[PDB]
Coordinates of C-alpha atoms and ligand atoms in Angstrom, one line a residue:
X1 CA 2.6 -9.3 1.7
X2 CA 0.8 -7.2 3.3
X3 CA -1.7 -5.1 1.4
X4 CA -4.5 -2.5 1.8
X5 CA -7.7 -3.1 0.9
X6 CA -11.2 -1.2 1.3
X7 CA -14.6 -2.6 2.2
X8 CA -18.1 -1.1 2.3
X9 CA -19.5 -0.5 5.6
X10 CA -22.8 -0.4 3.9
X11 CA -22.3 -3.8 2.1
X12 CA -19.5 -5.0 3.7
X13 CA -17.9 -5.6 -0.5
X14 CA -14.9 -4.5 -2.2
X15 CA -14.2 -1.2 -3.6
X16 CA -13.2 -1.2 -6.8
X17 CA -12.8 1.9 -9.2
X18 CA -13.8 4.9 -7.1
X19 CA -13.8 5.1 -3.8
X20 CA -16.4 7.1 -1.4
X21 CA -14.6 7.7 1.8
X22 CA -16.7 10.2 4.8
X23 CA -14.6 12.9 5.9
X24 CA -16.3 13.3 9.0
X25 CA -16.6 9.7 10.2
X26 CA -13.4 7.5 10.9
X27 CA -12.5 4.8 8.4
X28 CA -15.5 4.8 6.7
X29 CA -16.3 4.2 3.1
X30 CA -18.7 3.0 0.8
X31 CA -19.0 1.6 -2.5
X32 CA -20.2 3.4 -5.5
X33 CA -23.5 1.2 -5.5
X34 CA -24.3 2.1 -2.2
X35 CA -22.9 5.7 -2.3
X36 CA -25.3 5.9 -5.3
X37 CA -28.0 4.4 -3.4
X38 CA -28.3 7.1 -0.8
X39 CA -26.2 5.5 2.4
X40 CA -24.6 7.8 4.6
X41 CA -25.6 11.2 3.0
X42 CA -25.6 13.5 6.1
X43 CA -22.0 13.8 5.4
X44 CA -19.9 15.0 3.3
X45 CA -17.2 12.3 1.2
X46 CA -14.4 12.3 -0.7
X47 CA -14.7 10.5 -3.7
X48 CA -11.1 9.6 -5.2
X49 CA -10.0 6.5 -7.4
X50 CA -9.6 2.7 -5.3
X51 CA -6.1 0.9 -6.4
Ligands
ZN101 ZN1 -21.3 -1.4 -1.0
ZN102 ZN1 -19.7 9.7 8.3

C-alpha cells in the first residue's frame, strides 16, 4: 500500500491527532508541540484532525 502520512517540518515527527497545516506556504505543517511552541507564526494555518 501506499499511504499518506504527515511530518513536521519543525521536528521532522509524526502528526498525530490534529494537524497544523500553513495556508500560505506549500506542504507545510507542523505538529501540535511545535505549533504550540511558537514555529512558523507569521502565517496563518489550518488546524484540522490527522488520520
Ligand atoms: Zn513537531
Ligand atoms: Zn508558511
Amino acid at each position: 500500500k501506499e499511504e499518506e502520512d504527515v511530518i513536521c517540518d519543525g521536528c521532522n515527527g509524526p502528526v498525530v491527532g490534529t494537524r497544523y497545516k500553513c495556508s500560505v506556504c506549500p506542504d507545510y505543517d507542523l505538529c501540535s508541540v511545535c505549533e504550540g511552541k511558537g514555529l512558523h507564526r507569521g502565517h496563518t494555518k489550518l488546524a484540522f484532525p490527522s488520520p
